[model samples]
Every structure is written in C-alpha cells, then in structure tokens.
Target chain A: QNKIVKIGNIDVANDKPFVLFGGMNVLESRDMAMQVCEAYVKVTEKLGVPYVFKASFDKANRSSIHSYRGPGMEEGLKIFQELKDTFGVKIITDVHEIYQCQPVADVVDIIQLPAFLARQTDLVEAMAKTGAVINVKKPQFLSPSQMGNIVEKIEECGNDKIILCDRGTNFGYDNLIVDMLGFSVMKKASKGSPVIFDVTHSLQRAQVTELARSGLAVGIAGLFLEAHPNPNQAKCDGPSALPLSALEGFVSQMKAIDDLVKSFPELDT
Target chain B: QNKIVKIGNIDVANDKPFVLFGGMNVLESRDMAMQVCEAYVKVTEKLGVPYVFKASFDKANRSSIHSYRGPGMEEGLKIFQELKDTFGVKIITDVHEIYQCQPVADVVDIIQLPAFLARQTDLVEAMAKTGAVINVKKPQFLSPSQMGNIVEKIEECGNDKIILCDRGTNFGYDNLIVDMLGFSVMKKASKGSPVIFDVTHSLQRAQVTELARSGLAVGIAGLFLEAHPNPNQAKCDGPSALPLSALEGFVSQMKAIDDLVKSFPELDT
Candidate 1:
C-alpha cells in the first residue's frame, strides 16, 4: 500500500499516525462551516491527531431537488480560503462538475471525488490533471476490489496522489452497511492506496461508528467524518452527522485505538 | 421474499428447501458436462434438494486471449438439450451478447445475466422478452440495492420471472467476499425477489463457504455452485470449483441448514 499521500504538509498514510479528514457534510453556512472546523481543530490539536477540513460545495444527487446544496463554488471557495488562513489547516472538498475542478483544486489542498461520481472517467481525468491529492470515496454501489479500476483510471491521466475512502455500501433500501473487512480489501485492491473510513451519511448510526473504529485496527489512513454544532438543526443529513460536542471523546478514543493497533507487529495470517 | 419460482418441476424459493444451480464453470466437453451434472443429480436426489444444471458456453472475458472458452453456442446448446432429455433436469446458463439471448433462452430453462453485463439494458431487454426465467448475478461493482434497477429494467421489458444470484463481490485483487447479509438486501430491494448464493467464484475459500452456509439461515431461494468430478483437472476456475466428491456432503449440510432456518417463525427483527 502507498505509505503516504500529502495534503499540504499533512501526510495521510497507513503507517503514520491516523489522520482525521474532519468537518461538516456540507457548508450549510459560512458560520456553520467555520464553527465546525474550529471545533475539529481544537479537539484534534488536543488529541494530537493530524486533521484535514472537509465540506461539500454541492450535493448534486440529493434525494430531494430542493435540499440544501451548500454555498456554490464561488462562495464555498471564499469560505475555504478563510478557513485555511484562520486555522492554518489543510482543506478538502468535492467537485461535482468538470468546470469546478481547476478552481477547487486551486483553493483546496485535496480534491475529492464523490462516491456516486467516482467512476466518471471525465471527472477522474479532470481531478487527476489538477495535480491535487485525490480522495476517491468508495461508492455505495461499488465493491472494494473494483476500486483498483478507479485508481488506474486516475493514474492513466498521470496522477498517482490518490487516497481511498469507504462510506459503507448499500445494505438494503435506504440503509448502509460498513463491511469492516473492506479496509484491507481497499488497500490490496489499490496496490496499497491510503484508505479512510467515513461514518457520516451512513444511516446505521452508532453501529457504523463502532465498526469504523474497528477499521482502524485493521490499518487505515484516516477517518472521514461530519459534525454539526447542533445536529438536528443542520440542513443536510442531520440524523447521520455526529454531534459537535462528541468531537473530543471520539477523536481521543480513535487515536488510542490507532496507536494500539499500529504498535503491534504485522501478522503472518 | 419470493416463496417460490417454478423451474421445470422444481420449486426454487426462499421459504422452501434450498435448490442447487450446479454444474461445471464452463462446458469443456459434452462428456464433462454430463459427468458433472450426473454427480450433482445423484447427490441432490439422494439429499432431496431441488436441482438445476448450470454451465457457460462462452467465457467472454477470459483473462488471456488464448484461454479455453467452452464450446460455442451451437455445440453447447446441443449438449444442454441432451442433458435435459437424458437427465431430465432444468438448466441455467448465462448469455453475453444481445444476439445470444433468444437462442439460448430457447434451450436453457433459466437465462442468466453475467455480473459484469448485468446493467446492459439491451441484453436485459432481450432476455426479459424471451419469457424464460431470468437469473441476475449481482455485479461485483454494484450495490445490493442497485439490483432493483436491473430488475426494473427487465420488468419494463415485460417479464417478471427473475432470480437474483450473488457470486460474491470484488473484495481485493483476485479475491471475492460474500456479504451474507445481502440475501435479505436483495429480497427487500427487489420486492421479495428470489435470491441465490453463489460459492463457485468466491476466493475467500473456506470463509466464503462458511458464509454461504450462513446464507441459508437468512432465507435464500437457492444455491448457485460449480462442481467438477476432479476440480484440479477442470478447464476453468479449477481452484475455486468444488471437488465433485464433496458434493453430497456439502449439499446435505446445506439442505439441513435450509430446512432448519425455514422451519422457524418470522421474528420482527
């Protein structure tokens, strides 16, 4: 597996200390995004976990057309720039269309490919050409081994700075299940690509959170998470988002688990 | 979930005794096909498990260009016709190109959609219009919930005789993982569609075999398997094929599990 994928100065790698790709699901507002990042920064700094701020500019495939899509690229980039300057933290956000690729790449340390759009060749090519660290979300419809095809698609466009993230697969209608063994699958499938576990938007609730922690024991690059200061008041996927208040406990426990697992010798089996 | 789908005189259903869709990976020769089917027949008959014969005519996407690809359609269909006339068993085989649909449907009691070609609309349409029972292999790249889309596509083409099969999903390089929970996922996602667990192509080995057994506990419609009189001597996927000697013991255990699980009362959870 790849040892490290740099997002600015932070090296997201399986052998290194696990990082937290943390922030809200969407930029519900300038204040909300800033507040969420500020909380993440404080907790991560206290717990000594490497962190990257994440938020989506647009949810192109929301269940409802009228659902909030966050600030458009223009306003979202401005917020991202402010967060970078204010917190001095690396930022990651997904781009939905080809046109948004270059500008988003310019502002963010890492460009993310949404799970649903992970296989779109044009999108993969566009994001790759930007030379930004790429985070490919494992699609709900995709198997872990097939992720190599997506990695190859990106590499064919001359980009090898890739990270894989798992956010659970479709279990049944309107439900998601995290197959914990998939972390190792993603690593092997992508020839050692950095793999991260994502918990938000996985409707299994606490079961998903617990399973995600177990993923770290198997070796993963980091955690992809979303937190809301007031989860119920959040505009999108409120039910799935973690309470901002739980940030410290969650990151602390995760870091301890990461350290515990990484301290062990590799097994023959 | 679908209680039963009639294929010849056998009732393939989730609530009923588990059925076997068993044969070789490909029809290496007419004698080989008959030998494999005869073994499956004797075992299934002795154990009283419903049985259907399965084999592929063309290995459309073999790894190497020079790889052996079974007999062509004309020869393979003749073998299948003889198998039906002689052994008096229902047969299932997959088709790749749209053109093969009608002709294959003529002889095979159940026509299958290969996992990689499961989303091909034209192929699905052609198969559905044949009025032959359809077997949809959950693609390595597709989520369980997405099988409904393929079913809808077939249903839109004016046929509802469908069977959902899971050959395991792409877990890692050259490996496959069976998500046992997917049996229920397929059942719910496709509105009680019959679901079958395929153990032939999965490379997780004993873990997959163990999970395949657990699938019966979740109430699957049938078992999709490939067996050879001498797996090491088989022409295709010899490593993954079950040794024909193990057929009786394997099917007997599976039948016991299926009977035990189906005998229970439905619980709310």
Candidate 2:
C-alpha cells in the first residue's frame, strides 16, 4: 500500500493504472523478437497501456533439457539492447543464475527471478544488488501468505522495490489454475507490494479472461501476457500464447475491466 | 482401482459403498468421547454407514504450545482401548512420532499421517511397517497429483493400504478451499487409491456441503466429519466442528447424496 515499483517510467501500483508485461514466451530469433515487439507497441499504444516488453532469455526449468531454450544469454542481451535502442521501450527478462543478474539487469529495466529459483537466497541477494525492479514469481507450491517471507528476504538483502507475479499454481498434475483471490492475498501478505498476474503461463485459455477480470477487480498491479505472431508454430508454450492478432482486443477488454473496477469505491466483504 | 484398503471388517474402496470416518477432534474426555461415539453409532447405524470411529489422542502441531492438545498418548490409548471394548467398534487415530506408531497402531485399526508430516520419510516408513491402513492427509501445500509420490513412498516401504483425505488446500492466509475437482485428480494420480473428503477441517461450513456432494459424485471412498456437543465451547477447531445435534440431519443428507451418486453411471464432462 505504501510503495510503487517503477519499471523504467511506468509506475506499477495495485490501486493505480495497470501495466502490461507483454511479449512472446522466448527469444526464438532477433527477427521474431522485433516483429513481436512492433506488434505489441502498436496494440498497447492504441489501448493506452503502461507497457513493458517481456520474454525469457533462457528457459531454465523446461521439462526436459532437449526442450527449446531461447537464444543464449549473450545473444539474448544483444537483441534486448538492440530492441531498447530501436523502440525505446522498457524491457523485462528473467535471470536464472547469480552470475547473470548484473548483466541481465544492465540491459533489462526489470530482472525476474524465475519461479523455481525464487527461494534461492544467493540468487535473490545477487539480483537485489543489481538494483533493478525485481519481479519474484510466486512458486507453485507456496501459499500466498508465504510471499511476505520472499518479500522479506529481498528487502533484507537491501532491495525494497519488488513485485510478485502469479503464474498459476500446480493445480493437479499437468494443469494450472489462477485462483483470482490470490491477488488480494498477495497484496495483504506483502503489505501492499505490487502484485501481477501471469495470464500466459496460467494456461487456462479463455478461463484466464474471467480470471484476469476478477483479479483486476480485486486489485492487481498488472497483467503478464505472451502473444505470438503465429502461436501454433511458436517455439515454446504455443498453447498458452495469445494469437498476435488478439492483442489489441485482449488488452482493450482488460483495460476496460481494470478501469471500471478501479473506479468503484472499495467495500469491506 | 486395483486394491481395497480394509479397516477391520470394513472394505474401503474408490467405487464401493462409501465408508464414514466420523468422530470428534480429540479425546476431550472419557465421558465426552462416549457421548459423541454413541451418537455417531446411533445415526450411522440408522444410515447404514460402514464406519470407523476417529479421534486424535494428541494435536502435535498446534500453533501455540499452550493450546489444548488432547489427553497424552498413554491416557488417550487407554480411552481408545476402552471405546473398542465398550462399543465393539473399530477405531482410528493419528501417531505423531515414530515410537508412538507401534503402540498407537496396536490399538487403532488405522494410523493417520498428519498433513504437516506427510512427507516425513521416517514416519511414513515406521507407519508403513505397522501393517495398519494408513490415512495420508493431503498437505495443505501439496497438489493432488503429488499424492502419488507419497503413495509411492508408502508402498515402497511395503505397504499399499493407503487413503488420502483432503481437508482443503491453503487458499491464501488463514483460509482453506476444498477443490472438489481434486477428488478426480487424486484418483487418477494415485491410480485409484481411496480418496475421502474431510469436511470438518476444511472450515468452509456450508461450502463443504456442495463440495462433498460434488466430490462423491466424481467418486470418493468416504466422508470424514468432526462434531462437538457444544461447538462454540469446544476445545479445538470449534468453528469448523458441526454441532452434535445436527449430526443426524447432516449425515443423512450426505448419505443420501453418496448413495445416489454411486448409483449413477459415470458421465464424460
């Protein structure tokens, strides 16, 4: 409730205008990255969104080693810098290891701690030192109340600018469900730290439309979305990615809901 | 789907006539235990529920040390043995530590692994060796699919007579939600191990009414309930406990639903 985390010039606050962490799943190619970024810029600008370009440089915890990882860090960072110079847009990418934090933070406005490695103390400390806005993905097995502990860990390491992103939890086996109630739970747990929803990884398809609307109604800092130019042929997470053509309509609908919900006076349940 | 876990003469199966693991939270007193068990016996007999009386001798993981834990193990065991001798009923109780396993297992027809300690390899091994039916509480933090790993651990130690009781998943902080879909998930994950609903600990009050019925419709082995003579004045989990007077009507409704659902042919959703 007290703090607003900034990604470049975008102010992310649970009660304020929502930001969009929008892009593709991974950096399949520099050309693909450029094309996705261009489409996002058009859609988000038309919808009047506070936007940040998001994509993973490394698919660190993929189901198998043979699974397609993005372009390696060296190549990924070069593309990110190129995109930044070209679009002059805020960029966000996840850093897997301690060594990558500083370098990744150097190029990206925000450094993400992947869900699986969120609790690794050394990585949190290293990322904290980079002084980039930290987006800690809520782990699948963790209760929302436990997010405070992660917030505490990041704060104790001398960084207080932190955001929490819920990418759905491990529902059963190969399924994910976005418990919309988690937005308020995380907000209360982190003492009003910015909470964002990861709509792509949630994999609920049209279910996320209602989930996102409900989540924003409850109050969330932003929505993390992935859209591919051609999702069916995407390198990874093809099923969950929004069709590139759907971006304008998707964000427009979300923005309208977010605006309407934020306009209502708060009530005690 | 392959095995029936027997509790004394009762056959507990995913598709068989449902059983009732019904009783109070703890052994409040010999007189209280007698009163509750007697009422349970009367009502369950009326409804024809294949039953096993349940009570915990000790509440091992109370939030505070000063909170009421049931009568100590020795005294509690004396009461359980008496209940068995007096009522001619089979019993079930949880064992906290390894040493308590053999002694508690000796008197009770079934042994339960508390949710917090469900992953303790040593406890699981000790309880597995007891040759009693083991009820594994789905840990508040665990996904239903992960129950298989726990089943594997128990079976690896040479025991396959296992049951999973869902008290509910941790929703946020200090809240629980019975994901009724979890019944089917746990069934598929455990290869059809008996899955039961714990309506008492779920803390949803009337919410459990719908959840339990829906769970039974999908297929469940039984319902676990807790009742208190004076719920508001009860020792522990008073809020979640059903009033003893409501027992007949409450269970009668659940029994009717259970019988009806079991009689229906499975439908593809």
Candidate 3:
C-alpha cells in the first residue's frame, strides 16, 4: 500500500505526506479556473501540502442533460497547459471519451477516469494506454470489492502509477456517503497503489471539512477538492464546491489531520 | 394537510391510527409464509394495530443475480389469496415488471414501487391505472425535492391512493441512514399525500426498534417491516430482516411509541 506516483517533486503515496488534488469542478472559464487555482496553490504552498490542479474540461454526464457542460475540451486544455506552465504545478482532469485520453493526458499529469464510466473497459484501456498517472473515481453503485477490477484493469495495460479516489458512493437520491473503509481496501486490492479522497465530489453540502478529516484519518494518499471564488455563482456543482476564500483554513486543518494520523504507529487490528 | 389511504377498514394517514405493513421479504415456501402471516396477524390483533401482509413475488433486484428470487408471481398470488382468506389481512408487495402491475395489484391491496426503480415511468403509469393503493418508495438516489415528480406522475395517471414510503437513501458505502425529517418533507412535498417509513429497507440492521421510534415520532402513516422465521437462514434480505420470533416484543414497544406521538396536539414547532 505504499507506492509512489511522482509529479515534479511531489511523491503521491499512501504512507507519505498527503498531496492535494485541488481546483474548481469545471473550468467555468479560463479566468475562474485561474482565480480558483491561484487560491489553491497559494494555500497549499503555505500549508506545505503537495498540490495537483484538478478541473474538468467538459461535464459530459451532468445530472441534467440540458445543464451547461463547460468551456469544451479544446479551450480548457489550453488553460490547463497554461496553468501548469504558469504555476509550475501538477494537473488532473477527468477524461470521458476514449478519444480524449491521449490529448488530455498530453497536458494533464493525472488523467482521472470518470466515476460513471470507471468500469467501461474501453475507457479504462484507453486511459491506461495514456501512461499518465490515472486517478480513478469509484462509481457510486460500485462496491469497495469491485474497485479492484478497475485497479487491475489499469495494471494489465502496464500502468503502475494509478491512484484510487473515493468520492462517496450513492446514498439515496441527490446525496452521497463516503465509505471510510474503502481506502485501505483499495490499497490492499491494488497491492500498493496509492488511494486519494475526493472531497470535492463526495459531499451533499455542509460536510467538506468533516468528510476530509474522516478520509485523511483512514491514511489515504491525498485529498481532492474543488473550490470556487464565489461558489454560489460558479457554473457547475457549486453546492458541493468549497468557497475559494476558505482555502487556507481548509488546507491548514486538513494538513494537521493528515500529519497527526500518519504519525501514528501501525497497529495490527 | 392530512390524507387518508384506505385499506379495508384501516385509515392510513399522518393524523390517524398508524398501520403496520409487515411480512417476509420473499415467500420462501407456502408453509413458511403462512407461519409468518399467522404470527404477524396474531401480534397485530392483540395489539389492536391495523396490519397488511407484505412480501415480494420476485426478488428481481437481488444484490446478486444468482440469489434466489421469490416463489414466482403466479404461485405467490395464490399464496396471497390463501393468506387473505385465512387471516383476513390486506396485502402489499413490490411489483417490478410492467405486466406484473395489474395481476399483482389485484391480489395485493398496495403495490410498492421498489426504491431503486421508483422513477421508472412505465412502471408508475402501469401501476397507477391498476387502481391499487400504491406504496411508492423514495429512491435512494432521489432527494426529497424531486420525489414530487413521481407523485405527480401517479396522480396524473388517475390514481390518488398513493402512500409515499422512504427506505433510507444512500449513506456512504455499504451503509444506509433514514432521514427522520424526510417523512414530513415528503408529506408536505407531495401535497397532502400520506408518507410512511420503511424500517426494514432503511436499516443497516441494529437499533431497528430505535429507528422505528424515530420514524413513528415523525407521525408517518405507517411503518414497513420484513421479518423471517429464522432471519439468518432466510432466503433473501436476512441481514436486514427482523427475526420472526421477536415480532411482538419489537411491535408492542413500537405501538406504544406510535400511540403516544399520535396523541400529542399539533405543534407548529
């Protein structure tokens, strides 16, 4: 359960210092993405937390079909490349179609497999071939046990740098519940791949702090967060996004928890 | 606003006498079912509670495909007839397929919408036209706000005898939690529709009686329960099903809670 996927100097690992996969949900615009990431990186740097910029190029599978999808793949890819080069930070973006794998991977350091299609073998194969560190979001309906198959799918494609991210499973309608036990289970199942917690997507609102604390206590590899400068006015998933202004307080608190938990001696249960 | 869903002599409503929708998860055998029905009828009679025998003809949505479904639709319908003839109990059972609606509703007084399939348009319209008092479940994936759509669908199909049921929604991985306030939320959201709590489906086991008390305190129309002769050996849902032998001990206490709560004067607080 102690494998490392490197992004510049940040070593993402279960036993190492927790990395922060933090940014906005959708890049609402290049300006908003820049603003949110600027806050995230500044806060993360102040807290001495490893940081990876996370945003979606397109929201293809929104709750409502008619909802605004995003700034499209092409424009966002430009923003990501610029974001990476400008801030010199690692980046993560979820890829939906098989066609987006290579192009997305070319710019983003971590190519996240969307939760709904995490089990789609073709998508998994395509993402696996990208050779980017894969961040696999656990589908709401998929149980802890079945996630091993997604891990194994990536492994078979000869990609060992995989990160298992749990963003809460399906709690009856319009809600989500994080299964805390899933991190260690995925680590065991993956035979030492790092696991991260997606605090951004795991909430039904009013739960980001408590949920992040719970996930960190389980000895996960990282925390994935989405924050907006003015969350209420954000384009997509604003209800679940953290207020970008709260970045420092959130980061400092999460870092303290991660440090305290990781300092504990390993005791066999 | 108060609404009454009549089943035989029972008036199922928020302000009226509470009813018991109780029985096994699946009909394992004619004898076991009869054994279960007898115990339920005996306990409900002594306690002076309105009772409805609840069971599924098919376990089509069992967690695993290999799991045993119920004694097929036809066989269970005959079993329902026998139980009604002997015990004079009203009946409720979840119907999955479009074709199962009319036939199952004819024998069963209340047709239940499975929590997972609560949003199916075809099933809702089919069941509504049957004129059966529908025990509609709030889906684990459905939030309280959107449940109004399902209620509207049924009402538009020319059926107003709808009892909204909440069986806990998604609560973190491999777990569930009942939102106690959801009962009243649904009651108001559905605009005078009677809402009931499904204790059996809402549970992660343990504290069932406590959970029942909480649901009853919400002043719902009824509580849904599934019990088995030997819960450990029950063919389906044994983990969540109450042990049949302990039926009276649980219900007598629950009946007390229901009575006291219903007696309290309406408080706007």
Candidate 4:
C-alpha cells in the first residue's frame, strides 16, 4: 500500500492516493448530493483512490446575486459532514470570503482558498490561522510557477500542510483550459505537495455571452468525477457535470493514461 | 461615410460596431437587462463603437441547473426589444432552442448560435431559415479550421450573411485558449465570412476546484468584451467582465491588431 501524505485526515501522496470529486450545492434537492456521493462510493470502491467529497458551502461570490449561491455556509458544511460520516470518507471545500474559514475548517478536512482570493493577503492569513490544511487553487491570470507567492502567504501565516490543485487555465472567454505542465510546476513549487487535477469545472465552457457548453476532456483526471445518476436533473452544475453512467468507463480509461504516464516517468519526470 | 448595417433601423457593423456584453441569468432583474443595455449605449458612444445591446433571452442550457438560466426567453427577448427602442441602436442576442429563432429574430437584428449548438446542423439550418443574419460562435471544443463544416451548414440554409465569431478553443480544463492563428484559419475556412472575436469571455480564468485557476484569452474575438462603467459592481459577471474604463484602451489595441492582420492579404496564397 502506498503511504499517501495526509493533511488533516485526507491522504494524497502515494499509498492511498486522494481522490476529490465535486458535487452538492447547499440548497436544491438533498437527494442530488446523496446520489452523487453514492456514485463516488460505488465507483471508487472499484478504483482505489482515497476519497474526499468536495462541494460549495456558499456561492457567496457568484457572478450574479440571483445565482444560486449554495445554501449558507453552515448548512452547506453540515451536508459535507453528513456525507463524510455516512460514506466513511473525507471532505474538501472552498471558502471565498475571509470569514468562511472557521465554519468551513470545522467540517472540511481541507479548506481551500479560491483562486481569485489567493492574492487577498488577509484571507490567506486567516485561513492559514485555522491550522487546517489549505489547498490554494492557483489564480488563472498567473502562471503555475507563480503559485509560490500564494503558497508563501499560507506558510507565512503558519500553515504548511498544503496541496496545489490544477483546475484549468484561462482560455479566452469565460472558459478555461488545463495545462498539463501546471501540475508539474505547482508540484515542484510546493515541494512535495501533490498536485490534484480537478476534472469537472475544467470541462466547463462558460462563454463570454453566458452561453454554457461542456468542454469534454472527461478522461483528463487521474481519478474519479462528481458523477450523478442523472446530471441533467442535478441540483447544481448539470451541463458541466458528468453523468454517473459515464464515470466507470472514463475512470478506467484514465487509469490507462495514468499507467502510461507512470510507465515513462522519464517523460513525466 | 461608413454605411452602418441596420436591424430595424438600429445601426451596427462598420459605421458603428455595436457593443455587446454578458451575464449569468436574467431571471432576477428584468430591469437590469435594460440597465446593461444603457451601459452599452453609454460606453459605445464614448468609444465610437456602434452599440448593439446583447444578452441571452434564456440560459436554457447550463452546466448545472443550480447554475442560473436566464430570464425565461420570452421575458428576456421582450427586454431586449425594449432596449432597442429605448437606446435606438441594433440589438444582438443568442438563441439555443429552436423555438427561440423567430421570437428572437422578430426583435434582434443578428441571431447567434451558442457554441455547443454550433454544430447541430438542424439548429443552424433552422436559424438560417429565420432570414436573420446569424452569428455562429465556434465551440471551444473545436479548432478554427474545423469550422468549415459549420460554414457549409449555414450556406446550405441559403443564408449568405454569416458572422463567424471565434471565442477560443479547448485547452486543458475549465479553460479554453485563443490562438491568434484561429483568426486566419477561421477567416479562410468561412470564405469571406466576417469574423468577430469574443473578447470578454476570453479573459475568463476557468476554475474547476476552488484552488485551481486558469485564464482563457478573452481578447480572441477581435476582443469581444462587456465593459461596464464599473465591472466589480456590474449586475452580472463582474469578475470576468471588462470595465468601460478599460474599453478605449482595448479598442485602440484591438484596432492595431486588426489593422496589422488585415494589412496582409492571403499570405497563404
């Protein structure tokens, strides 16, 4: 068994590779979050990635106020806690505004600093004060190698357990593209902090005109997805969300890619 | 004197390039749409870009329903038409479902196809039949040269006035990247079709996880952007949005780029 490193209780290094999945919004059908959790449990049992359930506590900072900012932070984290208890897994989530840290840290095994806020010095320091492991998603406007500055903010605030997640890069418009090189660069910069590739939102094609389309690179992640039995009926993110039916096959294919990449460590190295 | 194209007496194109903008949903504010239109009018007059008010009648398709769908299409288009009469300028809007064509066509001068539905031969054919000049925004999933097939679909619909808009192409995750090469490639493929680059969305840094950040080049569509008097407080998409404060500088830069590109003719030939 590989001994993956642990930040709080979530292990990500190697032995028990951490698998992160995005699903669940605070409001909407409670059943939707449950269904996706079930899918993750069912799928990951077959694929051995140690799991972390990720969802939003609050979408406080959405493009529009009318937009469904998830249920309030408290209610959102409660759901995440319940999932961890019920599924026997860990949880990860985001904090946008500074005050979101304490409430989020209490439940989430890992508290994330939103990329936009990575530069908000005070927020990074506050989240770092929480002592919970922090994963700072890199800002899109900056290069991955530039993440050292963000990581330094967290370290300066006294939190060292960290991981860098590569969601995607700025592709013109409201869309983003994941750069394969970012994973390596962020990993190198963070010095042994495993880089997690977020597959779901990376596939979102949110155009400038508010036209949403799915950028399908479903098999990009080395792990599983936030797959729901019925994404079209999902309480949150349907267009960019993956279907549960497609998850198994997609995971298998990604495993193959992982193996291929692993086979030539020289190339990936 | 530059002859401006008219959509029901609203001037757009050449004599006055209509200004366009973006948002997440319109359900919350019927009044806000008109407000955004007014903002466009304010900025366009300031910058000399003929203002064409733009937004969606409905965000019928979203990654997650938890995501905002716009003001139901009917209400949305009604608001758009109101902007036309109020602002006395051309209006450009997008259509997703087939039912939207005529209703949207009745009010707006140019009809746009969402990038996802860009290849749905039936949808393009249906929109072409509306006799409204159709602007086809390329899917981020596809390459510029690949849009030749899309152009054929429009031509088959017997619509010669097609505007090929290049938003960007898929790069990694939650991100799309614009290749300047696309302008030349798409212009060549579309065979004299006027290519409009979507600028605002291009600068979007797609986020899959809270920790990861990626930027999509928003300057692609010859720099299509939505500039508010203030982007941070704009009713919608304030984050990725460009401010009118930045518009004059953007237009000058884009003019330089456009002029340089147009300076050379069929270099490939």
Predicted model with the maximum DockQ: 3
* Regions of candidate 2 where Cα sits further than 4 Å from its true position: A1-269, B267-269
As a whole number from 0 to 100, the lDDT of residue A193 in candidate 1 is 81
Residue A183, candidate 1: C-alpha displacement in angstroms: 1.6
Chain A TM-score for candidate 2 is: 0.96
Task: Please provide, for model 1 over B173-257, each residue's C-alpha lDDT reduced to its tens digit, 9 standing for 90 to 100.
Answer: 3446678777777788888888888876655445545766877778888888877777777777667787788888788789888
**Candidate 1 residues A1-269, lDDT tens each?**
46578876788787888989989888888888888889999998888889999998876644323346678899999999999899998998998777889999998989998775565555677899999899998877677888888887788778899999888876644556778888888788888889888877555546545765777888788888888888788787667788898889888889999999888888897
lDDT tens per residue, model 2, B150-254: 888788778899999998887654567788888888888899899998877877465556666666766689989888899888888667787889888877877
Query: For each prediction, how big is the interface RMSD?
Result: 8.4, 9.3, 7.5, 15.9
Model 3 DockQ vs. reference: 0.10
Off by over 4 Å in 1: B1-269
Model 4, residue B130: distance off in Å is: 43
lDDT of each: 0.81, 0.83, 0.82, 0.57
- What is candidate 4's lDDT per residue for B1-269, written digit by digit as tens? 22233445443332123334332223246666666566656655775543455666566656776766656777776776676678776767888888778887887788888888887877888899999977788887787888878878787888776667766566657755555435545656766455566655554422211111011111122234554445566434535555444444444333332332223232121
DockQ of each: 0.04, 0.04, 0.10, 0.02
Residue B164 lDDT in model 2? Answer: 91
Clashing pairs in 2: A1-A192
TM-score of the second chain for every model: 0.95, 0.95, 0.96, 0.76
Give me the runs in candidate 4 sitting further than 4 Å from their true place: A1-4, A7-10, A14-18, A25-27, A204-224, A267-269, B1-143, B146-269
lDDT for B73 in candidate 2 is 94
